[PDB]
Amino acid sequence: MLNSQAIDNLRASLETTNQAIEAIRQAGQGMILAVQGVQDYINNELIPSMNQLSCDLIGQKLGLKLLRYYTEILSLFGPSLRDPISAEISIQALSYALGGDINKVLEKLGYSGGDLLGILESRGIKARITHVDTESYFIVLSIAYPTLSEIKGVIVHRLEGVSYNIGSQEWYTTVPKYVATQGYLISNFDESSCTFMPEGTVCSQNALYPMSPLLQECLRGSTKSCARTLVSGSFGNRFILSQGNLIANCASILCKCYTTGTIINQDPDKILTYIAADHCPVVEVNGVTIQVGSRRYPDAVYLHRIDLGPPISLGRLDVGTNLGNAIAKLEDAKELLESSDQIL
Amino acid sequence: MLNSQAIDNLRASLETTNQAIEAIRQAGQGMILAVQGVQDYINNELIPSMNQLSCDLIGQKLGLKLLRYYTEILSLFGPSLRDPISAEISIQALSYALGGDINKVLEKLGYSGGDLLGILESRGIKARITHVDTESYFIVLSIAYPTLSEIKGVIVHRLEGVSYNIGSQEWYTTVPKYVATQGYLISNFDESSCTFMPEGTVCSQNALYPMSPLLQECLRGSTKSCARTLVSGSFGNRFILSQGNLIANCASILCKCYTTGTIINQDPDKILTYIAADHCPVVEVNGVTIQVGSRRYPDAVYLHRIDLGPPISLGRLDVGTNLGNAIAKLEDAKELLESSDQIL
Amino acid sequence: MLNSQAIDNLRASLETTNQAIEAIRQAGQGMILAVQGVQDYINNELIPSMNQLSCDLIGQKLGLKLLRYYTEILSLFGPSLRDPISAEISIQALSYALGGDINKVLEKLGYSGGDLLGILESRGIKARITHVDTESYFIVLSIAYPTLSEIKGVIVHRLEGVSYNIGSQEWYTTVPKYVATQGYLISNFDESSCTFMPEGTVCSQNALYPMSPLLQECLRGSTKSCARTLVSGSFGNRFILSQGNLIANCASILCKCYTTGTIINQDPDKILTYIAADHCPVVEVNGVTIQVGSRRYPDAVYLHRIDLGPPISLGRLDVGTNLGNAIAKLEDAKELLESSDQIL
Amino acid sequence: QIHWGNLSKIGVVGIGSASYKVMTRSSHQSLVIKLMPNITLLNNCTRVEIAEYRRLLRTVLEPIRDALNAMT
Amino acid sequence: QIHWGNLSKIGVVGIGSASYKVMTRSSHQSLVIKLMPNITLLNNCTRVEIAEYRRLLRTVLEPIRDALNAMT
Amino acid sequence: QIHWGNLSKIGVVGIGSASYKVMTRSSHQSLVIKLMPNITLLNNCTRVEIAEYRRLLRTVLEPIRDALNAMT
Ligand SMILES: *[C@@H]1O[C@H](CO)[C@@H](O)[C@H](O)[C@H]1NC(C)=O
Ligand SMILES: *[C@@H]1O[C@H](CO)[C@@H](O)[C@H](O)[C@H]1NC(C)=O
Ligand SMILES: *[C@@H]1O[C@H](CO)[C@@H](O)[C@H](O)[C@H]1NC(C)=O
Ligand SMILES: *[C@@H]1O[C@H](CO)[C@@H](O)[C@H](O)[C@H]1NC(C)=O
Numbered sequence A, B, C: 001m002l003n004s005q006a007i008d009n010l011r012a013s014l015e016t017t018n019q020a021i022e023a024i025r026q027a028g029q030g031m032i033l034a035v036q037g038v039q040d041y042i043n044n045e046l047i048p049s050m051n052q053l054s055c056d057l058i059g060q061k062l063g064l065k066l067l068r069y070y071t072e073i074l075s076l077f078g079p080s081l082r083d084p085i086s087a088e089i090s091i092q093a094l095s096y097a098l099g100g101d102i103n104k105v106l107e108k109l110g111y112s113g114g115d116l117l118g119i120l121e122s123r124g125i126k127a128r129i130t131h132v133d134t135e136s137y138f139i140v141l142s143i144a145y146p147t148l149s150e151i152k153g154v155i156v157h158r159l160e161g162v163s164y165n166i167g168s169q170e171w172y173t174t175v176p177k178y179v180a181t182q183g184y185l186i187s188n189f190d191e192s193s194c195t196f197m198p199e200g201t202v203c204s205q206n207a208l209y210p211m212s213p214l215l216q217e218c219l220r221g222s223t224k225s226c227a228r229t230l231v232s233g234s235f236g237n238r239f240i241l242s243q244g245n246l247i248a249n250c251a252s253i254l255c256k257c258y259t260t261g262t263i264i265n266q267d268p269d270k271i272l273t274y275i276a277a278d279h280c281p282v283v284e285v286n287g288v289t290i291q292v293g294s295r296r297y298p299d300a301v302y303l304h305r306i307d308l309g310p311p312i313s314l315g316r317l318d319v320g321t322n323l324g325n326a327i328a329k330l331e332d333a334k335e336l337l338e339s340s341d342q343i344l
Numbered sequence D, E, F: 001q002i003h004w005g006n007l008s009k010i011g012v013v014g015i016g017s018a019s020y021k022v023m024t025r026s027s028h029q030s031l032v033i034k035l036m037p038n039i040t041l042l043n044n045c046t047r048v049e050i051a052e053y054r055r056l057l058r059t060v061l062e063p064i065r066d067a068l069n070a071m072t
């Protein structure tokens, strides 16, 4: 009687336990599908998207390297690419062609350093494209290097004229724009194919031809042999500007120092008036305002500022706190069930 | 008897339940290891990869921002970098140096607006690189701005000649290419250092020198004083082209209009023949075909088209179905298991 | 009795298993939160971070496309952007403007291939910017195309003079730098607006004017009609270089072949001495060293080498071995539970 | 008919020869360079990059437009 | 003045007219171009990229400095 | 031996002085510019980007080759 009710009590109590394990077991299968679904999403939609981002980023790195190379080529060989017939070469391309230094450029070309300044300023070095290969994408340039010969003792003089007054009459002397001297000898000079520079004149053709005996006496002191023009019904120039010094014919006209306001009065004995930049930076001659001094403007600076942001900082996932509790609970029942199993 | 086998009936059933719980308990550690394995893959493989991608992408953003700056430097200061000795400045570099506008440029340089057009077209502004610093990567440009003085009342005239014909004899008058007039006064003009432009001539050196009395009469009307050349055994030009109007010596030769086909006959009283581009766009003179009309070609357009692609957009992982199902199937048995103890 | 102890031990053993299951249930709760925490991390800090990475890379792709397009525009239309008043056009811009080929350029413009060589080398084609639209970022470029007329039968000759000796006296003949011939006719030539080239001179203005009867006799053979210049107290040039041939007046001076060391003797029968670039590459005339031969330097190559790196390789996650282990053990408990029910 | 034999006995030599071509009335064409390419997406991912390119264009184009107005 | 009617009867024509302006003492200004912009972060990500830009700068700037030192 | 003192009494002044150098036979050198750098990887991630660069090169280089062939 007592046991029979107890057997029924164990019958009902054990009945729910079998159902209890079934429910948690099927819930366990739900976890497996959940974890598998996480794995599928990572493998099928994160890894392919990660690799596509990595593949696209490699292409952008190469495209920037290739564009930086072309910009360097455009920087150095720009004029040659646009003008394949005849274009000046860069100082960067000249350095590269002859070794890798300007000292190698001067030694190989036999330039004095002041010869390179004359050649660079006159644009004497030309590059011509002689072959373009559109299959392997290269071009061949043909650079021509000028060769200079200096005639010792020859000095080139540039002449500039101005009208002068002797009494009430205005005269003008006709002289060549350029003359050349070699010691005591004087010759004419043709500037058609020449570049006049402080270091020296570089002429692509000949410029020297002899001078007539009459013009030689003019330049040597006998000014009465010089050809003069009376300015009657015509006009010339009344001032010259030369390296910040003004040479003017202030006779029978009004010359005024515009800065100080004083009248520049010419001594009758003297022929021409010389005005320096410091004494008068701005001068009025015959109503014409002339700037003798050089104005300086405040310095300017070209700048750029780049502001960027640090990349993202993804921390650790850190889900071990929940895993540890489940591990602790799993071990709790692991020993609890085994110890109770010994009773059986 | 019956209770004895009843105890064994519970004994056989209960012992299997302990084994049943043991199986799912070890399967629980299988889930934990899988979840831990997922976390390790994310922390050790995906997080380092995104940070590497982010670090690489930040470098590419700077590189593109930093190459775009150079392309701006090359765009504005290109000719100066290639030719440090002497190079013209760009219109963009001129505005930056003098304030930030052309209006500031005109007032600081004292230009009339038509003076800037003359200076820009003659390339009068030059920049020289005076200092290069390689440690801190900057250069210093020295810019020289011309100052212009206008001689008020002086007008420069360009002369062009053609071989006129009187009777059956062809002549040619020798005149200077350029002359200058100041009211009623006429002088000579030297174009060596000058740039002829519609607004005005900008001369780096002096150009005005007086004219002889004999040539003054020739230009003032007394054409008998002009120096004339009989072209016998030689040849000159027989037509001039000027601003779409053709001046030709059609005497003794065959002039015809190529377009209409008519023959241009010169009246004996008239010396020269004037042909406008409207009446005849193409003219043949002495067998030479002259294009006096202006041809216009159809407009061309340079343009580019860029096509992009929408960025990827990964959706939500969405594993809450199986995970939510397990939650329902987990704590449903929480009360079911607890119910067993209550009846006990 | 005996069953009472057996039932009590069974009741105690069953009671422990109830605590055993509940511990497993709470461990199951930890797994759900751990899996949910993994899913939350992916949707909160991985998907948003990757989309930002993808969004950033799309902008970088367009920026590189845009910069490459500008570098193409700067490569073609560079000089026009810096010089909006008057700049030469590139060969790439000329090809695009008139069709898309140089053959279409030649036919549309009426050039002959050698006409384009003389126009490209003289820089006759100029572009002017006539409209800038900053609202929509385009510029209108106006291009002027020269039209050429050839005077048939006219040949331009360049004359270069050198001094010569008659016994012990040095003379110099004055001739124009340029002359022109048409069959048997000889005329003068003005090189002010011309560009001397092997294919033909292109003059922007007229260059032909007649020659005096006295100078015609000089050029036709009667050399006694030419104007001479005794070189006394002056000096000229004693050598000419003409494309690898040296014409020198080695009379009364010392000329030697710098290469071979020999002395170049001027035979009195001949007036001038001709030296070829092969017989003597370097020549000294009157103490002046002249380079007659053409030096050649070893070829140079400008090239770049780019080394890349393979993208990251994220492999399969591969955590299915632990999931499969739990699946197998869950299946065992599913079967084992049914067996226990049969006993009960 | 220049006699180059007699003329070289007085130091005169000819160092060139070419034909003669004189420039007549010039032709004209208009070329429109569109510096902003036509982009079809215009998403939120490209707004900043398009503005950076536009600022580059204003650096170059604006001094040209402002100088044309002043000189004309 | 010039009698343009009479000069046309002898083949002389006037094909232009302009004012006369002569150049005087020039002004001067110094412009400093900083080719390396001021970058603030300079972290470990932006190390190889800045070095590659500096290598580009040396390809251009170094020949200029060497030529200036040699010619001056 | 120009008398610069006596010559300034008649309005003639000297505004410069320089040596004289005349150009002589020129030297020559060939320079080969490889516009396409040497890429070693050539993966599937760089196929499109290399083609975009080649199109840029053809825009510049092709008119040069065509002009050289026609003019020579
Ligand atoms: C220079 O001028 C002075 C006085 O004007 C004169 O006596 C002299 O002969 C001239 N010539 C020379 C070479 O001194
Ligand atoms: C121009 O010619 C006309 C008629 O021949 C006459 O006035 C004179 O000869 C010339 N004019 C002058 C001002 O000499
Ligand atoms: C060239 O010189 C020779 C000999 O002096 C002779 O034929 C004649 O004088 C000259 N020729 C001509 C065509 O004048
Ligand atoms: C730009 O592209 C769009 C879309 O293809 C289309 O309207 C046309 O091709 C262009 N439109 C304009 C206004 O440039």
Ligand SMILES: *[C@@H]1O[C@H](CO)[C@@H](O)[C@H](O)[C@H]1NC(C)=O
Residues within 6 Å of the ligand: D044
């Ligand atoms: C795009 O940007 C605009 C302007 O900030 C904003 O209104 C819009 O919501 C954005 N679109 C998306 C999809 O974020």
Ligand SMILES: *[C@@H]1O[C@H](CO)[C@@H](O)[C@H](O)[C@H]1NC(C)=O
Residues within 6 Å of the ligand: E038, E039
């Ligand atoms: C760059 O910016 C920083 C900001 O901290 C400043 O201190 C530094 O002087 C700047 N460098 C320059 C302007 O060269």
Ligand SMILES: *[C@@H]1O[C@H](CO)[C@@H](O)[C@H](O)[C@H]1NC(C)=O
Residues within 6 Å of the ligand: E043, E044
């Ligand atoms: C780069 O520098 C950062 C500090 O900004 C440091 O954390 C990191 O370890 C460095 N990496 C290497 C490879 O030196």
Ligand SMILES: *[C@@H]1O[C@H](CO)[C@@H](O)[C@H](O)[C@H]1NC(C)=O
Residues within 6 Å of the ligand: F038
């Ligand atoms: C450079 O390129 C050529 C042809 O493209 C190839 O043969 C060579 O191997 C490359 N250089 C190196 C170092 O691999």
Ligand SMILES: *[C@@H]1O[C@H](CO)[C@@H](O)[C@H](O)[C@H]1NC(C)=O
Residues within 6 Å of the ligand: F044
């Ligand atoms: C690379 O591209 C080629 C050409 O389409 C293709 O055949 C090959 O399978 C690709 N390789 C990989 C690893 O995707």
